């Protein structure tokens, strides 16, 4: 893991020592090489786990998240290097440093073998995205969004720290494999119920669970494009990864303690899909779609079925890719028309045909068109939920119907229809942003071609 961590660390001196006319080129190229290096974690020819060191290890669950982070860093640089052209050189290098630090800390968080180090890197990732949102956001409400994000996460994560220290005192090491082997069954008392809630509520906050999801739409709206990408594509999945890692020592009382959160997830995905149906802001629509998909992931992890875990992993990877792609397309329209209003730009299919093709493919990925990994994850989550209870199919079907409805509504109101001819400032297309859309869509196609990479721990 050190062979990925060290050159990502060396990206920062490269950023601060490169010429201002060469910084973007050098950092983008070497981050692409970093991702190519990170692809060596897929060499898993055995049932064992690649425990590289005493503090770093690789997993069938951790590996796709690490590869996705390393792949998202150059895409974030390409996405963010347009709204920083009228910007100071040291501020540009600081922004690149923030993105690189996010990538480093997220790779270390996913490769961590010890839960206290996982929590330390959790908060370490909490810092620079707050800095990015607050400093390079556009509207006034970025400060309130950053406060909401930071303190939802902190109030979640403090009882997680208390619970981790308690489990460390009880067991001795807080090492993941040691806990997985010497797991003890809890006796289902009120203290154990509170311990369960303490170690689950941080991840449920960052997922986000319904009712506590209020930080996410304003944070994603007010964030810059790279911040929205890293948030919606890695940090929610970081919460899910924490849930999967910590759920192994919570038997058996997760069986009955999972009940309120499954109901919250299902009804919240219905409610947030309805909000997407009636939402006037494109980034808000994408954010609430992310809330619904992560609610599906929450329900799968709560029901703790091998099909549910596999569908959760596939939906994590697929939703990260398609949500970053949707945010990049919305940011292209935002850099064109300087607005986020859903209905303001309408006939963009006429002027931007290839970008309309990218929009259509992103939305078809969003509504889980087969045989994509989006549909793979959603279908296996549905199968596991129907095994858990046959009446969940009603909520699943309503969610699927509204999902297709808001995705096609987005397509029709942003691309189809008559062209808003007053928008004289419609530059044709940037090869940079078309490349960004291609670099989002192609890994979706390749993972659709070979879905065995992102199945996860259970299969």
Ligand X SMILES: CCCCCCCCCCCCCCCCCC(=O)OC[C@H](COP(=O)([O-])OCC(O)COP(=O)([O-])OC[C@@H](COC(=O)CCCCCCCCCCCCCCCCC)OC(=O)CCCCCCCCCCCCCCCCC)OC(=O)CCCCCCCCCCCCCCCCC
Task: Report if residue 446 touches ligand 3PE, rule: CB under 6 A.
Answer: yes
Alpha-carbon 98 to chain mean position: 17
84, 141, 171, 413: residue in contact with another protein (rule CB under 8 A): 171
Q: Cβ(138)–Cβ(229) under 8 Å?
A: no
Task: Report if residue 198 touches ligand PC1, rule: CB under 6 A.
Answer: yes
Task: Report if residue 437 touches ligand 3PE, rule: CB under 6 A.
Answer: no
> What's the CA gap between 281 and 139, in Å, rounded?
14
Question: Would you say the C-alpha torsion 135, 137, 139, 143 has a positive or negative sign?
Answer: negative
Q: Cβ(378)–Cβ(295) under 8 Å?
A: no
Q: Segment near another protein (CB under 8 A), from 21-29, 240-248, 292-300, 395-403?
A: 21-29
> What's the CA gap between 233 and 71, in Å, rounded?
11
Task: Report if residue 368 touches ligand 3PE, rule: CB under 6 A.
Answer: no
Q: Segment near ligand PC1 (CB under 6 A), from 33-41, 193-201, 327-335, 418-426?
A: 193-201
Residues 76-95 that bind ligand X (CB under 6 A): 90-91, 94
Q: Cβ(367)–Cβ(239) under 8 Å?
A: no
First CA to last CA distance, the chain:
23
| 345 token code pair | 């730009």
Q: Cβ(456)–Cβ(58) under 8 Å?
A: no
Interface map 417-456 toward another protein (x if CB under 8 A): --------x-xx-xxxx-x--xx--x---x---x-xx---
Give the one entry of ligand X, another protein, ligand PC1, none that residue 104 binds, where binding means its C-beta sits below a cut-off of 5 to 8 angstroms depending on kind.
ligand X
| 149 token code pair | 């994000």
Residue 61 CB, nearest distance to ligand X (Å)?
21
Residue 114 CB, nearest distance to another protein (Å)?
9
Task: Report if residue 390 touches another protein, rule: CB under 8 A.
Answer: no
Q: Cβ(99)–Cβ(226) under 8 Å?
A: yes
Interface map 55-74 toward another protein (x if CB under 8 A): -----x-------------x
Give the one entry of ligand 3PE, ligand PC1, ligand X, none that residue 134 binds, where binding means its C-beta sits below a cut-off of 5 to 8 angstroms depending on kind.
none
Give per-residue burial for 362-381: e unless 16+ CB within 10 Å, then b: bbbbbbbeeebbbbbbbbbb
Q: Segment near ligand X (CB under 6 A), from 11-19, 72-80, 279-287, 408-416?
A: 11-19
Q: Segment near another protein (CB under 8 A), from 43-51, 225-233, 286-294, 318-326?
A: 43-51
| 243 token code pair | 């849930």
Question: Would you say the C-alpha torsion 304, 316, 129, 67 has a positive or negative sign?
Answer: positive
Residues 73-132 that bind ligand PC1 (CB under 6 A): none
Q: What residues line the site for ligand 3PE (CB under 6 A)?
A: 39, 42, 64, 67-68, 71, 193, 256-257, 259-260, 263-264, 317, 364-365, 369, 372, 443, 445-450, 452-454
């Amino acid at each position: 893991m050190l062979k990925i961590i060290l050159p990502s660390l060396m990206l920062l001196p490269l950023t601060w020592l490169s010429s201002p006319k060469k910084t973007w080129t050098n950092v983008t190229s070497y981050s692409f090489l970093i991702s190519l290096t990170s692809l060596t974690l897929l060499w898993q020819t055995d049932e064992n786990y690649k425990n590289f060191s005493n503090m770093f290890s690789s997993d069938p669950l951790s590996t796709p998240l690490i590869i996705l982070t390393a792949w998202l860093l150059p895409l974030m640089l390409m996405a963010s290097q347009n709204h920083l052209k009228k910007d100071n050189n040291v501020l540009q290098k600081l922004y690149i440093s923030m993105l690189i630090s996010l990538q480093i800390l997220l790779i270390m968080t996913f490769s961590a073998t010890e839960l206290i180090m996982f929590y330390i890197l959790f908060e370490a990732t909490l810092i620079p995205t707050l800095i990015i949102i607050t400093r390079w956001g556009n509207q006034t409400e970025r400060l309130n969004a950053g406060i909401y994000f930071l303190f939802y996460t902190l109030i979640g994560s403090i009882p997680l720290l208390i619970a981790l220290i308690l489990i460390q005192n009880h067991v001795g090491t807080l090492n993941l494999m040691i806990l997985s082997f010497t797991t003890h069954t809890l006796d289902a008392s009120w203290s154990n119920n509170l311990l369960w809630l303490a170690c689950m509520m941080a991840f449920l906050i960052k997922m986000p669970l319904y009712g506590v999801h209020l930080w996410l739409p304003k944070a994603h709206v007010e964030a810059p494009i790279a911040g929205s990408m890293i948030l919606a594509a890695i940090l929610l999945k970081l919460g899910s990864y924490g849930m999967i890692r910590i759920s192994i020592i919570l038997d058996p009382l997760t069986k009955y303690m999972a009940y309120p959160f499954i109901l919250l997830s299902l009804w919240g995905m219905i409610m947030t899909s309805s909000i997407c149906l009636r939402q006037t802001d494109l980034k808000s629509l994408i954010a609430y779609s992310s809330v619904s998909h992560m609610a599906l992931v929450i329900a799968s992890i709560m029901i703790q079925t091998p099909w549910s875990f596999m569908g959760a992993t596939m939906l994590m990877i697929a939703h990260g890719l398609t949500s970053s792609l949707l945010f990049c397309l919305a940011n292209s329209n935002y850099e064109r028309i300087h607005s986020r209003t859903m209905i303001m730009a309408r006939g963009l299919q006429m002027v931007f045909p290839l970008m309309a093709t990218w929009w259509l493919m992103a939305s078809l990925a969003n509504l889980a068109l087969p045989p994509s990994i989006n549909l793979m994850g959603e279908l296996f989550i549905t199968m596991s939920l129907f095994s858990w209870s046959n009446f969940t199919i009603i909520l699943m079907g309503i969610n699927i119907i509204i999902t297709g409805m808001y995705s096609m509504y987005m397509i029709i109101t942003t691309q189809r229809g008559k062209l808003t001819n007053h928008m004289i400032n419609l530059q044709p297309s940037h090869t940079r942003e078309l490349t960004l859309m291609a670099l989002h869509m192609i890994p979706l196609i390749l993972l659709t071609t070979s879905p065995k990479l992102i199945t996860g721990l259970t299969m």
